[PDB]
């Protein structure tokens, strides 16, 4: 049994009073952190505020980390600084950062190396576009993307994979649980081949497409879906029910 | 115009190093009504640094998003910065132009967003070594400044920074570029506006060279990097006192 993993990616949202209440509207929900991981990823300038308000059962992290260490990189947050602040998790390679800020697989690899080097846990995202899927390149692109960083994973509890089906985000199309499952299986096989069977069976793989209260239960019951990276729906108080689906 | 001395800590610091350095700084007496002093820590250090620093010190962040709130994982909107009462933002720093491909279009959009949310902007620009070697210094800087200068409303609330990426720079060279920068503001904005606007030197500034830079007619302060990590930074503040 892999520990399930449910993550709130607030993205660029929130406003002091908004957090505060939502963090309290969580919080009341009882769960055991020894059996289920729950991580909240607020905006960097909300981290301290959100960490204080959330109870120890909730893990926290930030939505990006630098590929450079400390030094002359205006605007960046190093893994070193994140370590010092006891920031536990980092998100790496999110589709939005690949798209809008030109993050490559080389960046993902380097960000992951830096994060592990400073005892950080990494939520690493990847996935294929619609036209890559239309040409039966799903397995090809995902293999390339995963192989870009997968040889760096030391402890397989501390690195968590996220499949974001870019092909069914802002495109019209929509992924069924069976399709997600089939890709998740393939992702696990890639980890099996490159790292070993035990490591592949240990590693959490989350679904990072559109997750809400309506579809969450039918996704988590899939064999190789171990949780979610939730966006839009993690801004709502009902997110607590998405946590209950993995409970 | 008020002189303006800014600490750009870049990607440096620890909770402890900031407790002491911020205490060092607090001891130095100065009047915020006569001299602006801004500290730009890394985003995850902002709250920590704001609490420790006394009200006389202004604070800000080292970058801001060009998008508003929404699906932009990793970004900090001017909206969010407003809500947190963050006063200043740095825009268009050389390191972000270089490593993260920030353009003049980005600078312009980040500035618009910042003003739109009542934020003060420290806007950087400057020419590379090869641009300087081909006598394009004035050309590049004119292009870079003109990219955003038509957006400035209150000329106390937007502060220019000339960073000689090409380096280092002597005070005469800096002064000559600063003069040209002011002229661009003068004849593409107005007289009271160019004489109002602060223009900082953003190259390597330390205790040795700070005094000879600030005495130049058109140098109104600094954006200090490396040297702003030290307790001696307080002496760089004294040079503009």
From Swiss-Prot, chain A:
Gene3D superfamilies: Aldolase class I
GO process terms (BP): gluconeogenesis; glyceraldehyde-3-phosphate biosynthetic process; glycerol catabolic process; glycolytic process
Result after altering residue 72 to A: 3-fold decrease in substrate affinity
Residues involved in D-glyceraldehyde 3-phosphate binding: 9, 11, 170, 229, 231-232
Annotated EC: 5.3.1.1
Active site positions, chain numbering: 94 (electrophile), 164 (proton acceptor)
Cellular component GO terms, alphabetical: cytosol
Pathway: Carbohydrate biosynthesis; gluconeogenesis; Carbohydrate degradation; glycolysis; D-glyceraldehyde 3-phosphate from glycerone phosphate: step 1/1
Alphabetic keyword roster: Gluconeogenesis, Glycolysis, Isomerase
Any one Gene Ontology molecular-function term assigned to this protein's record: triose-phosphate isomerase activity
Reactions the enzyme catalyzes: D-glyceraldehyde 3-phosphate = dihydroxyacetone phosphate
Function as written in the Swiss-Prot or TrEMBL entry: Catalyzes the interconversion of glyceraldehyde 3-phosphate and dihydroxyacetone phosphate in the glycolytic and gluconeogenic pathways.
NCBIfam families the record matches: tim
Oligomeric form and interacting partners: Homodimer.
Matches recorded under PANTHER family: TRIOSEPHOSPHATE ISOMERASE
Family in the record: Belongs to the triosephosphate isomerase family.
Protein name as it appears in the record: Triosephosphate isomerase
């Amino acid at each position: 049994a892999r520990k399930y993993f449910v993550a709130a990616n607030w993205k660029c949202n929130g406003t002091l009073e908004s957090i505060k209440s939502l963090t309290n509207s969580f919080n009341n929900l009882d769960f055991d952190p020894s059996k289920l991981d729950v991580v909240v990823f607020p905006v960097s300038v909300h981290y301290d505020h959100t960490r204080k308000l959330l109870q120890s059962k909730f893990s926290t992290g930030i939505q990006n980390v630098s590929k450079f260490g400390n030094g002359s990189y205006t605007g960046e947050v190093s893994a070193e600084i994140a370590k010092d602040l006891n920031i536990e998790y980092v998100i790496i390679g999110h589709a939005e950062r690949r798209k809008y800020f030109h993050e490559t697989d080389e960046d993902v690899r380097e960000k992951l190396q830096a994060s592990l080097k400073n005892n950080l846990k990494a939520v690493v995202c990847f996935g294929e576009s619609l036209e890559q899927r239309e040409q039966n390149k799903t397995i090809e692109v995902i293999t390339k993307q995963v192989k870009a960083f997968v040889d760096l994973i030391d402890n397989f509890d501390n690195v968590i994979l996220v499949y974001e089906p870019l092909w069914a985000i802002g495109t019209g199309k929509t992924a069924t649980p069976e399709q997600a499952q089939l890709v998740h299986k393939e992702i696990r096989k890639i980890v099996k081949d490159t790292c070993g069977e035990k490591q592949a069976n240990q590693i959490r793989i989350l679904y990072g497409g559109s997750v809400n209260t309506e579809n969450c239960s039918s996704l988590i019951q899939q064999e190789d879906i171990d949780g979610f990276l939730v966006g839009n729906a993690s801004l709502k108080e009902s997110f607590v029910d998405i946590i209950k689906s993995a409970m």
